[PDB]
Amino acid sequence: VTTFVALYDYESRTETDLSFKKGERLQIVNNTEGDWWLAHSLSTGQTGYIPSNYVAPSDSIQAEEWYFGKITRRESERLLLNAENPRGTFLVRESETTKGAYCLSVSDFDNAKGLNVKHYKIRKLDSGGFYITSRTQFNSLQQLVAYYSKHADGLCHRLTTVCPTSKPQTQGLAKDAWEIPRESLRLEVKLGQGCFGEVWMGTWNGTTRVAIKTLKPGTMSPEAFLQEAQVMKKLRHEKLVQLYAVVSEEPIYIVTEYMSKGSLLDFLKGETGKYLRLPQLVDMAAQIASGMAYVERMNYVHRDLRAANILVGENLVCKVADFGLARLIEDNEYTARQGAKFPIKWTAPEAALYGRFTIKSDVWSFGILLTELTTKGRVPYPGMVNREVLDQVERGYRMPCPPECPESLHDLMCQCWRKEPEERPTFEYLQAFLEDYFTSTEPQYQPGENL
Numbered sequence: 001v002t003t004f005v006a007l008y009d010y011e012s013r014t015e016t017d018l019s020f021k022k023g024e025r026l027q028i029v030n031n032t033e034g035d036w037w038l039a040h041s042l043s044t045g046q047t048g049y050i051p052s053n054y055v056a057p058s059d060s061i062q063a064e065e066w067y068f069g070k071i072t073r074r075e076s077e078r079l080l081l082n083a084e085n086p087r088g089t090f091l092v093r094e095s096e097t098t099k100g101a102y103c104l105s106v107s108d109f110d111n112a113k114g115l116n117v118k119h120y121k122i123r124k125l126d127s128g129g130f131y132i133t134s135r136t137q138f139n140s141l142q143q144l145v146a147y148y149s150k151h152a153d154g155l156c157h158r159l160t161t162v163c164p165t166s167k168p169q170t171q172g173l174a175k176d177a178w179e180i181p182r183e184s185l186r187l188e189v190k191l192g193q194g195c196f197g198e199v200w201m202g203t204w205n206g207t208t209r210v211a212i213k214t215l216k217p218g219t220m221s222p223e224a225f226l227q228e229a230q231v232m233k234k235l236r237h238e239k240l241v242q243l244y245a246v247v248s249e250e251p252i253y254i255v256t257e258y259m260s261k262g263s264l265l266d267f268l269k270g271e272t273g274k275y276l277r278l279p280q281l282v283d284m285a286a287q288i289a290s291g292m293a294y295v296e297r298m299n300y301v302h303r304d305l306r307a308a309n310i311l312v313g314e315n316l317v318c319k320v321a322d323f324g325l326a327r328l329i330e331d332n333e334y335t336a337r338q339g340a341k342f343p344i345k346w347t348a349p350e351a352a353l354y355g356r357f358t359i360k361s362d363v364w365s366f367g368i369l370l371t372e373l374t375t376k377g378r379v380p381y382p383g384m385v386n387r388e389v390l391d392q393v394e395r396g397y398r399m400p401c402p403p404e405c406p407e408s409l410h411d412l413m414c415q416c417w418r419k420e421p422e423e424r425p426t427f428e429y430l431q432a433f434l435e436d437y438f439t440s441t442e443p444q445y446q447p448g449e450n451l
């Protein structure tokens with residue numbers, strides 16, 4: 001039994017889980033594994049299961065507000081570059097490139113680069129202490145942060161503000177919540193309409209904001225959906241919209257992680273996508289590619305990858321939604337890859353012609369998606385009707401490089417559009433290509449030699 005501290009507030013939805021406020025002290029066992037831990041709160045004397053990502057052991061670095069653990073270099077920059085953060089906003093993370101070194105990431109402002117993030121490798125001493133520059137050593141990470149909060153002393157700027165963040169999603173709505181009753185869900189605001197149902201913002205069990213998709217009766221077999229949903233339930237990645245729960249009887253409701261900024265396609269159009277710069281668009285493509293690289297690793301298939309099925313959150317977070325759902329659609333026309341509801345302009349020819357949906361036809365759809373990303377959301381094949389597209393694509397026509405899409409990205413698109421699926425790149429490749437698309441000379445980490 002270790003004492004853990006609550007990193008965030010958590011409102012107890014159910015009977016068996018535990019409500020707690022941040023800073024509460026909770027007793028939890030030695031080895032316990034999984035997403036939900038049994039806890040006893042010393043602070044309240046109350047008992048119940050807790051989401052394990054909401055706690056850390058007392059008096060660890062993981063309990064420190066400014067410690068973001070395994071966050072990626074690119075993702076730390078996403079959070080730190082929020083325009084509301086003052087200069088000197090910071091976090092500490094593990095180094096991606098150097099053993100059990102840590103890294104201090106700090107927001108800054110420059111007359112050359114503007115708003116930018118500087119990264120300082122924090123190395124550990126034989127003593128167990130830490131240092132950024134060997135001339136100034138500390139016994140602990142906390143002492144290090146305290147010192148550079150008072151004096152830049154070589155750093156680009158004094159540490160001012162702990163990087164802010166939203167409470168993380170829990171994994172599942174509760175321990176053992178999966179098939180839920182319609183009554184647990186309050187549909188609050190209808191957000192959109194599709195061919196086969198609607199999308200809602202809602203609340204589960206009076207506590208938790210969720211998205212709810214409602215399907216038109218007869219869209220899918222409830223039994224088939226349930227069987228697939230067991231498979232989708234296992235797909236867990238920061239760039240995949242989480243599938244929380246399902247109401248299995250007609251009409252089917254699908255309960256999902258709520259994404260505050262709506263679909264990428266809508267986002268690209270209108271009063272916010274007009275301003276996006278290429279590095280932001282490439283970072284959004286890189287997030288999407290990372291989610292699809294997980295799908296690829298898991299030997300799954302999206303089947304309808306396009307901007308309308310990417311959802312946007314705070315700070316240009318992008319997540320893949322509705323993976324695998326298209327396969328269950330019971331509509332004679334759609335299943336034929338035919339009709340006004342089939343996204344033929346995103347569909348690889350072998351998927352259109354022979355129904356061969358694979359990760360490589362998703363790769364083709366990603367190439368089309370890159371086209372939406374670089375045109376503020378214009379429909380692909382602009383002057384072509386859905387009826388012509390397949391034959392043109394089979395004959396070898398490919399969209400030209402959109403205006404103000406760099407040629408190197410269009411060459412990436414053309415790779416995604418090879419006729420032969422096995423000659424299209426992997427999402428693994430796409431993610432690395434897009435993550436490394438912009439480079440510099442040697443500035444990765446600030447030379448902490450002598451500040």
Ligand SMILES: CC(=O)N(C1CC1)[C@@H](C(=O)NC1CCCC1)c1ccc(F)cc1
Pocket residue numbers: 192193194195196197198199213214215304309322323324325326341342343
């Ligand atoms: C025409 C159309 O809107 N769709 C199908 C062509 C693909 C949408 C659709 O009907 N969504 C429903 C309506 C609101 C949410 C649920 C769609 C998107 C991804 C999928 F995995 C499955 C269906």
